[PDB]
Design a protein around this ligand. Structure first.
Ligand SMILES: [Mg+2]
Ligand SMILES: [Mg+2]
Ligand SMILES: [Mg+2]
Ligand SMILES: [Mg+2]
Ligand SMILES: [Mg+2]
Ligand SMILES: [Mg+2]
Length: 65
RNA sequence: GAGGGCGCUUACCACUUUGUGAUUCAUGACUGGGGUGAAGUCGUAACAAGGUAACCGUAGGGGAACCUGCGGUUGGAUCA
């Protein structure tokens, strides 16, 4: 029942969280503004730095990338 | 002796070889389009007079649907 056997490289490194619109077009680019709101609020629960480097917005709102 | 056989020889002829051409299948850097997409970008050309009535031939032009010229057609509308 011992829990920490293996090692893990890359495991503490910072991420590049990319979110892209799938099927739906203007609405798949409108749920993508709610996955970014899912993880950017999760990264503030445990004190991380979101850094919006590139973002192209949808027509009716959200993010297409 | 006549005649036959063997040999030789010539004629026809299969193998095989050379030249060139047709044709069909495979393939080829690349390129012209075509078809299918439960989402993208740029427009809105068509269907209502679709907001420039559409369309046919042809010609020229333009990212693209197209647009314009000349002729034609009604498979156009409104005529108070
Ligand atoms: Mg139109
Ligand atoms: Mg117009
Ligand atoms: Mg018109
Ligand atoms: Mg027109
Ligand atoms: Mg018409
Ligand atoms: Mg012109």
């Amino acid at each position: 029942q011992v829990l920490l056997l293996p090692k893990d490289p890359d495991d503490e490194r910072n991420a590049f969280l990319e979110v892209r619109a799938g099927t739906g077009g203007d609405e798949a680019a409108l749920f993508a503004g709610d996955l970014f709101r899912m993880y950017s609020r999760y990264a503030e629960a445990r004190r991380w730095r979101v850094e919006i480097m590139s973002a192209s917005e949808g027509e009716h709102g959200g993010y297409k990338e």
